[PDB]
Structures are given as C-alpha cells and as structure tokens.
Design a protein around this ligand. Structure first.
Ligand SMILES: N[C@](CC1c2ccccc2Oc2ccccc21)(C(=O)O)[C@H]1C[C@@H]1C(=O)O
Ligand SMILES: N[C@](CC1c2ccccc2Oc2ccccc21)(C(=O)O)[C@H]1C[C@@H]1C(=O)O
Lengths: 733, 735
C-alpha cells in the first residue's frame, strides 16, 4: 500500500502473524495490526483535511507489513531508504519519505532503528516500549510516544514508597520483558533501600511444577507478603493459577503484563483478590471508532489486507458464507489500547514538519524548493525531540519527547476487586486514592523482615540481609545507646541516645552526728583535766593529746571522703593507738641495759610507728575508689583504697602491738606499789579489744551495707580515753 | 565491476578520492585505490588457481568504489544486501555474496559495518585501524587484518618505561586519530606509573602560532624532554617545522602518523634527530609486484577504472598513446597490500573450513551451501582461524582476537644521519637494541623528576604536577614520618618516624660526681657519729641539733639517687629539717642562759609542723614528681626535675632562709649578753655561717636551674659545709 503525497510517511504495522515456519505471514492480526494501521490512515486523512497543520502540502503514506518479524521488517524497510538516498534501460517510482511511524514490537523497531539511523530518517514507534531504545548512542534517530519499560519499575516502587512496604519479593519472566524490568526495579528500589527478599526468573511456561517451586520459595519468606511481578501475560496467568492450586494468599503487584485483563484471573479470582496492577494510561479515541465502524470492503479499497480482515473477523471460508450486509459495530469491536498512541505518533511528525515548513518556507505555504531534499538530522534533533502540542480529539494530554525520544510516562493503577477498578494513576506524582482498595485496606499489609523496636531493644545484628535488623535489649548496666551500638552514661542521667555503664559521696543523723558529740565530749574533759595547776605527768598530757587527736580525725572523718582522708585516717588510727600506748609504758620497769633508757624507749616507740606509716605511704598510694558489683548501684565512693591488702595488714599490725603491750603491762609488772594504776592498765585492754571486733566484721565479711559498715566502726573505740581522766578525786578532794 | 562465481565476495576500496563537492567522486586514487583493488583481484585469481583452498568452487567477486565517503559507501554496500537476504520478488541480476573485503578508511568501514551487521554478513577490513571498531555490541559482523590504533599507545608507552622515562609531555591531533589515541596512552601510562607533564590539543587547519604556543608550553617543563605524539602526517610534518623555527631541542616519540616518512622532516631535518616513530610491519608481497607489472589497458578488461588509472598515473590514453608499462622505477608496492591479500585469504579459509563441515561428502557447493549462515560463518569459523600468510616466508600467522582484530606488529624506527632505521619492533614484547639510536648514543635522555628521594629528605612539597614534588628534610629534632606528613614520636624514641618530645632519662651521675659526692656525704655523717659516740656521761639539745643536721646531710646523699613522686616532698623536708634542727638547738641554748625557761621541745617541734604545713600546702599545690625541662634546642629534656617549678626552691627556701637570717640577726644584734664566751663564740660562729650560706645559696642555685653541673651541686654543697661548720663546735668546750 502506497498513497501519493508530497511528503509520504512510512508505516510498519504487524498486520500478519509470525505464522508457521516457511509460512512467515499466517493469520492476520486484527487488533494490533489492522486497528492501528487504519488508525494511521484515519490520522492522515485528518491531517489532509486539517487547515492548521500542513495546509498547502498534502501528506501521503507508504505503509508496509511488518509480519511481526525482525528480518521481514528489514526487507520491507529497504523500500523506505531505496527512495531517499539511493540516487542511482519510472514504473513503481518510490517517493522520498520524511520518516516512518512503524514498529509495534520492540524487536522489530530495534532492527529498523538500526537501519534508518544510517540514512538519516526519523522514526517514531507507537507501541515499542523496550528500555534498550533509550540510549541515543545507537538508536539516535529514534523516538516513541509510549513510555519505556523501566518507568514501570520506577512507578512500582512508588507504591512501595507510599504504602511503607519494604521487605518485598519479586518474580520476573524469562523473556527480555522483566529481565530488563526487575534489573531496573532493583536498581531503583534500593533508592529508598527497598528490602528485596528474593528474585525468581520463572521460565516461559516451561512446566507447571516451576510455578509451584516459585510459590514454595515465596511462602518460605512469610515476612514478605507483598510480591512484585514483572511477568508477561502468559506466565502471570499460570503463576496465580498455581497460587489458587495451593491456596497461596498474597498481595501481588504486577505490571502491564498483568494489565487489567479478566483472562488472567479467570477461575482464580479469590486468590488474586486485592492485587495492585498497572497498565498504560490510554484514552479511547471516540472519533476513530465512528470512522472504523464505517468500513466495509465495498468502499475501502485502500487497504489490501482488508479483504482478509473481513473474512477472518466475520468468519468466511470458501463455503461465500460472509455474503451479507453486516457491518462492524460495538457488538463485535474493541478500540485497541494503543490507538491513541498511534494517532499521536503521526501528529508528532505533522507538527514537526509543520513547524519546520513554517521556517524553511516562511513566505509560502506550500512545499518550497528548500525542502526538495529533507535534512533528517535537522528534522529529528531540531524539530521532533523539541515538540509540544495537545493530543488531538482528547481535550494532562500534551505530547512531548524527553532527551531520549521517549514519551511522557503516564500509567493507571488498577486493583482487583470480581472486577478491576482504577484506584489512582501515576505520571510523576503517585496520586492514588488510599481508600477503595479491597485486600490492601482491611487487611492492609506492612511487609518487614523484622518488627519495629522499642528504646529498650537497640543492638541490631541483621541476621538476614542489611534490612533484617533484630534488636536485642541491652542490659541496664550495658545501657541502650543506638540501633548499631549500646553506649554508656555513667553516674546519673539515665538513658536518650546513650546507655549507662558504671559511674561512681552520706549525711547520717545518728551515726553521722554521734562522732561529733564524742569528740566534743573528750575535748571538754581534756581541757578541764588540763586546766589543773597541781603539777610521767607530761606523758599523760601528751597521751590526752593523742585522744584529742583521735577525736579530731573522727570529726574530719564525718565530711565527704577524699583519697588523702584514707591516708590521714590511716595515720590517725596508728597515731591514736601510739599516743595511748606510749603513755601506758611509763614508770613500769622500775622494780621488776643502760640507766638512760627513757629517751631510747620513747624514741624507739615513735620511730616504729613512723616507719610503718612511711612504709605504708611509700608502698601504697592512698587513692579513692567506689566498690559496687552491679552497674546500676549508687554512684558513690565505697572504699578509697583496698583496705585489705594494706589496710587490713596495717590495721592489724597497729592493734597487735598495742594489745600485747597492754596485756604485758600488768601481766608481769612485779610492782605492787600503786595497785590502782596496774588495775587501770589491765582494765584498758578491753578498750582496744572492742575496736578490733568492730573493725574485722565491719568490712571483712558481709560489708555490703556501707551506710553503717564503715560509719559504725568509726566511733567504735572512741570511748577508751575517759577511763583514766577522772581517777583523781580519791587522793585529793 | 562484477565477476560471476560460486561465492562472490564484496569489495570496497577507495578507488576515487574526494576531489570536490561538485563531483560525486573527483580524481582517482592510485595507492590506496587501484593498488589495493588489484591486490584483492590478484588474490582471487590465485585462490581459483589454488588447489588446496576452495578447490571445488570458483570464488567470484563484487567490488565497488567507496569514493572515500561514508554516504557513498552505504549506497554502494546496499547492492550487497539487495542480493543475499532481500529475496522478496531480469536487468542487473544480483547474486548472493558470502561477505565483503572492504572498508579501507575507518569512517567508511564503520558505516558499512553498521548496515552489514543487520543482514548477518561477515566483513573483513584490510586498513581500518580504529579503536571503536573493537566493541562487538555494535559491530559484531566485522573483523580486521590490521591492529587497532590503541595498540600503538601500548607499544610506545612500553618504550618509555623501558628507558625509565617517566616525566613526559604529549601533543595530540583534533579528530578521531590521536584524541582516542592519547586517551588510550593515558590509561596505559598510569598503569606503568608514567606521568604526563602537559597535554596540548593542536588544531588541524590553524595558523602557525597555535603550533608555536604548543612548543612554548613544551619548554615550560625541561624535566620532560621525551614527548609523545599522535597527530596525523600533515600536522606532525610542520609541528617540527615550528620546532626548527624556535630551535627547540626535543626527542620525539611519535605514532604512525609520523611513521618512517621523510616528508615529515623534509625542511626541518636538523631539529628532529633521534625521533622514535612506529610503523606497521608489512613485508611486501613479491608475487603481487610481478603481477602488477604485467598490467596494461590492453590486457586488463576486468577493471573499469584501469583505463582512467592509466591516464592519471602517466598523465597520458589521451595524448601519450605510448606502449609504456609499469616497472620498478615508477612503482612501489603500497604498504597495506599484505593485509589486503590476508583479508581475502581469511575469508577464503573460513569458507573453505566451513565447506569441509557443511559439505564433507563432496568438494563442490552442496545443498547445505545454498544459503550461508552469516552468524555461523563469522563466529564459528572466521574468528577461529589460524593460517600462515601466503607468499611470505616466516611469525606471520594470521588470526583474529575476541574482537576480530589482527595482532599488533609495529616496527620501531629512528631518524639517523638523513634516514630512518628499524631499531626494533613491538609484536608483543618490546625488542629493540639501545646501542643503535642517535640521541640514545650521545646522552641517552632521562626525562624524570625529583623521583629519587632519600628518606633524609623525606618531605614532599608537590608544587606543580602531582607526579613531581620537592624532597627536603623535616626537622631533625622534630617529626619526620613520610612525604605527606612529618609526625612526632617522642624523645624516648628515635627519629623514619621523627621524634620531637617524650619522656626520657634524667640521671645526674658523672665520673667526677660519682666519687666526690658519695664520699662527701659519708664523711659528714661519719664525723657526726664519731663526735656523738661519747660515753663520758646540756648535751641533749646539741644531740637533737646534730640529729636534725644529720638528717639533712642524709637527704643530700639520697638527693643524688633517682627521683620519685615523693622526692620533692622529701627535699623540702630535708632543707627544713636541717635548718629546724640547727635553728632549734641554737634557740634552746640561747634560752638556757637568757614564760619560764622550760618550753624547748615545743619550740623545736613547732618549726617542723610549720614546715609540714607549708609542705602540705606545697604537696597539695603539686606532687613532688619530675619536670622534663627541655626548653633549649636539645631534643626532649632531662627527666630529673621537681613536680613544681623553681618557685618551691626559691619561695620555699626563702621561708626557711628567713628564719635562719633572723636568728643570725637576733643573735648578732639582739644578743645583749657578752657572757658565755664558749657559747657566744659558737653562737657567733653559727651567725657567720648563715650569712655565708645565704650568699652562695640563692644566686648560686638561681641561675644553674637548666644545667645539671651547677644546679646538681648548687644545693648539696650549700648546706653540706654548714654541717661541718658546726661539727667541731662541740670539741671546743672539752680539752
Ligand atoms: N509493548 C510491546 C510489548 C511489551 C514488550 C516490550 C519489550 C520487550 C518485550 C515485551 O513483551 C511484553 C509482554 C507483556 C506486556 C508488554 C510487552 C513492545 O514490544 O514494546 C508491544 C506488544 C505491544 C503492542 O503491540 O502494543
Ligand atoms: N589506518 C587508516 C587511517 C588511520 C586513522 C584511523 C582512524 C581515524 C583517523 C585515521 O587517520 C590516520 C592518520 C595517520 C595514520 C593512520 C590513520 C584507518 O582509517 O584506520 C586508513 C587510512 C589508512 C589506509 O591504509 O588507507
């Protein structure tokens, strides 16, 4: 079929089928081929009768059969290039085409785009939506009015973005459709870190058991109850048939391969209930229907295949039975989905050629001599890819091409409810209705590999993928810091984005106030005793100083603990014992080496005590520390030093020397004069005994109660010094 | 031209070069045209005459002019597909072809390989050296006998590293050659760690100053004398002409655009000595020369261009009308004829082998041959071929890589005095003899940068080019860790890390101080012990003063030992103990002769508590640790020091000295008791010692804080003499 015109247009419509082997062109296609072919013929007549597009130049066509085959399209397409650039003894003269409209299947549009790119002929495919046609490095002279396939994958995740579904499983088809879609999906899905569970490439209707094995691999991940489908129409039907076979409930999200066909869900409506699906955002062309209804072989001689179309549609073999005045009516007719895309493709060239005509031939309206040869590169790059016009007969319906010659990406969101229902649409903003969904509203799923986590449970190890975090609750001693690590805070400020580890000061009333009164009571008695003016007399006054010194340490011991306090307290305990013990061993070994032994005895006793203190300070550092096993215990200091390695040894050594001296002071004194003094020395042994008893059990065994374990033993031996203070009223009044 | 045969072959040669846009073609090519065309036609006449290669089938041809234009090639090559695959239904009867041998130019071969790709028909190109033909995602029905250009970028870069040249410049042409050539050079140069000084694109048809500016840029990096070139012949022809103008002495390593052509240097032969230029290795076909001699318009009816070629080569026939022929004087075999014959034979063997499988029963064209599977012929038989090149005695085996490319075989040339000389070749291992190069003889160039960089001068400044740097040494007493940073590690360690400040030793032991200081401390203690060991019997106060002074002497002896966290406290106590012990004894003796005279121990003990309270505040102010004073240029500092600064020595010593000064003034002026001459003389002796000690104590130790020679003995000797001063006062009262 060729129609004479000043600027003829190409056309490659799959009128026939792939046939059987040598029979390359079998039964003729009736919805994809004839409806789209007559759509372009309808569009061309509209352009010719139009007065604002190509009003002087008449637009012709050169339409050809693709036969839905790659090689057959190439041989047919040679009749396009043979006219334009083949400038080599008039019949069947070919006309210089401006550009082609053909290419329905992406397979045949690629093989044509690879040919016309060499001869500078623009191509617009009305239906081919393959992804590999969007790289202008190869198919530079190519455009299309349908969005590419990977726009679906970008639109697919939008629902996953809008419905918060993350842990998803995907199944793709063995063909190119899906093996370029799920690859495009995975790259785009992970943009919001969509949490892909699995990925299965079901065979092209290989075996029924394959679909079952897929379902086995699907239900084994119950945390992913939203499954995304990019399968073709044939495979999609067989999968859900297997799903109904084993009653595998799911929430399928499927592409235009599912579309909005009732044939897919025929006999398995219940299993696929509530599935969200997409299809091309088509729009019926009302005017085309009226034109198509008014067709019959009596008045339509342009189409050579129309005779077979009448025979195949209205069944008519050699027996003719088709002899009848019947026409084509809505009873037996269906405007094909991509008819609006076919008529848009033609009007893309008409507008591209009209704008180019208005510039290259500005004064005139017909085809001026400047277009006797058409510049293919200029027409495509400078006029086709930069076009903007509302779609004819369809009052967002504006036609344009992106930088890759692909059309604007509109879609319609269809949910299975049994009938499909448009639940919104996606062009660039997913403006679907949150309601009106059936199995995604009442049983609205939220597919995650793991549950959300409370502040107690932070530490995640992600046993599965990165998006399968499992939170274990860090202990209060460990504390909860962040979802990837548990931090600490120490003392106070219990956790915020930080846990709490250990972090290490006791104002008592009875125990705390008791030492002050005891020290004050001793000070008053010492002052009263020292206030006498009667006359080892100085030793007793010095001994009273040690008792006063011991009381002062207790008063200082009532304040907040300090590392130097333990060292000072250690000196105070030794000094207090030395002061009391030094005075006792005076005027004793009289009756019973050198005559001048009092100075040596006094010097030796003081030197021994200083040696122990100096050794303890040089060997051991009197620091500060807090003793607590639990990490949630009070953040206060418990033991400044060890108190056992050195404090226990040092404390025991001081008491032992004093205890032995007190016992031996009266055990074998051998001095009967002043027997009252001997009894007092012997009776003073019990004063030191109470301190040892109150000191060992205080912190040796069961010393956890630091409130009274340490404070209780502070004043344990603070009352021994009052025994000999008042023993003076008997001799003198 | 068409030759009927069993399996005719396509033919694409640039018979006519682009004369003008007015003419479809213009004038006729001579060397890339008829010479190459007759090479294919010669090979075909040889294969048919052959019996061991396609014996049962007659191999025809279908040769067409490419007009050296892409668009013309497409229309011509369209005659190939119109026969084989376009079988859809008598003048100009076409016949199926098994492939084409064509695509001399890269641009022509690309467009043809694009169209022939669609129809599953193999193509072999005999001269299309281009890098973008080696991707099989676009041109998968396309092989090559010649290597691609980017193998040169490998070869010459392999030349640079073999001579250790690392700092290099580059100049490249505008168009496809060079721009994709130097890009491949850069990827390989960084592979062998070769850095580029400057990169200058040079315009194709531009005024001379553009070339002059390039040379001026080249001189900006004298450290890079070796420079790489990739421009085609005409640009390199007069770039060195501009080099002779400025008289810029470089050594040039250049691509096949330069080649072994005298026309490049003709005019500026002097400037471009010792250049290293690569050329494709192509041994001439002797049989073709003999065949080409016997070619005249009378015996050449196949060629429809030979008559035009005859009138063009000899300028004839039109006017000459002479019986002349082609001989060795007016003819030289073109440099690509080896590849044209190889290209035909590659398809001939591929057809031959793929005939031994499809028709093994016979030798003729069986029914399985009626339609040839192009994909099967290319991938299964064409790419997997291996045969020695005909007419060339041998390493001449023809094969195709995974991208259908002939293996790189370049000849390394060199200008010499002028003529070129094959100084080596690059098949796969660069094999050239260094002894036979013009500039490599006289001062073989070594174009490097500050690359040799000793660890001493570890630091790198990198002022300009990133590959270059400046090696200088970091601080000898500071960090020196690497060429990017010089971090400190500490005086305890050593400087390639570089140590600046850290804990170190602080010993204060010397040969002179080891024997002197030890004996001095022992002598003072021994003298006091001897003077105290008396069994004769107010000596108690003197004994306490001796004990107080003796303790200070022991502190000085222990002061020569190692430091500790409590050494500062002990040192403060020692100074107070000696002064308190000495001062305490004097006060009791004075109060003995001149509120009752019974409070003596309390006065002596009070000073110790006062010193302890001051020590406690000083200890509370800071622990008596160590101070690693290293203010001067000496690395680190001596660990021997006090926890606090010199204020404790001065302020703390000032308080103790003030008490001694008051006692000397109180005893000297406020005495008012001339009696007790033995006590007054001893009291006067103590006052004199106190004044002498103060003069030699404060300033002596106030300036030797840094040096250990003065500060080490500034304190031990300051108080040591005081102990000996009062040591002998006891013997005076006796006999
Ligand atoms: N849109 C189609 C088909 C589209 C597709 C695109 C690329 C690869 C495979 C592929 O197969 C499927 C399968 C299911 C759904 C849509 C496709 C095109 O070829 O572009 C074209 C038939 C449509 C028409 O004639 O209107
Ligand atoms: N080898 C050539 C030419 C090659 C080249 C390749 C790509 C782009 C530019 C370009 O120009 C230069 C310049 C200098 C040296 C070699 C080339 C090819 O086209 O491959 C082919 C003409 C040679 C023949 O033998 O007819």
């Amino acid at each position: 079929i060729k129609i004479e015109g000043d600027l003829v247009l190409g056309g490659l419509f799959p009128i026939n089928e792939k046939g059987t082997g040598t029979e390359e062109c079998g039964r003729i296609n009736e919805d994809r081929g004839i409806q789209r072919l007559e759509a372009m013929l309808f569009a061309i007549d509209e352009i010719n009768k139009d007065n604002y597009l190509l009003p002087g130049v008449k637009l012709g066509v050169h339409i050809l059969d693709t036969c839905s085959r790659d090689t057959y399209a190439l041989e047919q397409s040679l009749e396009f290039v043979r006219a334009s650039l083949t400038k080599v003894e008039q019949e069947n003269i070919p006309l210089l085409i401006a550009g082609v409209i053909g290419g329905s299947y992406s397979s045949v549009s690629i093989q044509v785009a690879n040919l016309l790119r060499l001869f500078q002929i623009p191509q617009i495919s009305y239906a081919s939506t393959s992804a590999k046609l969007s790289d202008k490095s190869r198919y530079d002279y190519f455009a299309r009015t349908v969005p590419p396939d990977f726009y679906q994958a970008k639109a697919m995740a939008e629902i996953l973005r809008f419905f918060n579904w993350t842990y998803v499983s995907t199944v793709a088809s063995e063909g190119d459709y899906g093996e370029t879609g799920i690859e495009a999906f995975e790259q785009e899905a992970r943009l919001r870190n969509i949490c892909i569970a699995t990925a299965e490439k079901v065979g092209r209707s290989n075996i029924r058991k394959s679909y079952d094995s897929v379902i086995r691999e699907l239900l084994q991940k119950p945390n992913a109850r939203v499954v995304v489908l990019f399968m073709r129409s044939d495979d999609s039907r067989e999968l859900i048939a297997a799903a109904n076979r084993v009653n595998a409930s799911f929430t399928w999200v499927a592409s235009d391969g599912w579309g909005a066909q009732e044939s897919i869900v025929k006999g398995s409506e219940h299993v696929a209930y509530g599935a969200i699906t997409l299809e091309l955002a088509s729009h019926p062309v009302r005017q085309f229907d009226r034109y198509f209804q008014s067709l019959n072989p009596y008045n339509n001689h342009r189409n050579p295949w129309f005779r077979d179309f009448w025979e195949q549609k209205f069944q008519c073999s050699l027996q003719q039975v088709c002899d009848k005045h019947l026409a084509i009516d809505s009873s037996n007719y269906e405007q094909e989905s991509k008819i609006m895309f076919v008529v848009n493709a033609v009007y893309a060239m008409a507008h591209a050629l009209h704008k180019m005509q208005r510039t290259l031939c500005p004064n005139t309206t017909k085809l001026c001599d400047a277009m006797k040869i058409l510049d293919g590169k200029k027409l495509y790059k400078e006029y086709l890819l930069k076009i903007n016009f509302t779609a004819p007969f369809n009052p967002d319906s504006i036609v344009k091409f992106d930088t890759f010659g692909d059309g604007m990406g509109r879609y319609n969101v269809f949910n299975l409810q049994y009938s499909y229902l448009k639940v919104g649409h996606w062009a660039e903003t997913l403006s679907l209705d949150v309601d009106s969904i059936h199995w995604s509203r009442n049983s609205v799923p939220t597919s995650q590999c793991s549950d959300p986590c409370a502040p107690n449970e932070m530490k995640n190890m992600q046993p599965g993928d990165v998006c399968c975090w499992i939170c274990i609750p860090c202990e209060p001693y460990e504390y909860l810091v962040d979802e990837f690590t548990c931090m600490d805070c120490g003392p106070g400020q219990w956790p915020d984005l930080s846990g709490c580890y250990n972090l290490p000061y006791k104002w008592e009333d009875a125990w705390a106030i008791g030492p002050v009164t005891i020290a004050c009571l001793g000070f008053l008695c010492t002052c009263i005793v020292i206030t006498v003016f009667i006359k080892g007399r100085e030793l007793c006054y010095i001994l009273l100083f040690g008792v006063s010194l011991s009381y002062c340490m207790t008063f200082f011991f009532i304040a907040k603990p300090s590392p130097v306090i333990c060292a000072l307290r250690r000196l105070g305990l030794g000094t207090s014992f030395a002061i009391c013990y030094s005075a006792l061993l005076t005027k004793t070994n009289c009756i019973a080496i050198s005559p001048s032994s009092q100075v040596f005895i006094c010097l030796g006793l003081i030197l021994v005590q200083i040696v122990m203190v100096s050794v303890w300070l040089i060997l051991e550092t009197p620091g500060t520390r807090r003793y607590t096993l639990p990490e949630k215990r009070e953040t206060v200091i418990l033991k400044c030093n060890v108190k056992d390695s050195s404090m226990l040894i040092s404390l025991t050594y001081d008491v032992v020397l004093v205890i032995l001296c007190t016992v031996y002071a009266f055990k074998t004194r051998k001095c009967p004069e002043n027997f009252n003094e001997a009894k007092f020395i012997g009776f003073t042994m019990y004063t030191t005994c109470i301190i040892w008893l109150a000191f060992l059990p205080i912190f040796y065994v069961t010393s956890s109660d630091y409130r009274v374990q340490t404070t209780t033993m502070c004043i344990s031996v603070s009352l021994s010094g009052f025994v000999v203070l008042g023993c003076l009223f008997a001799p003198k009044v």
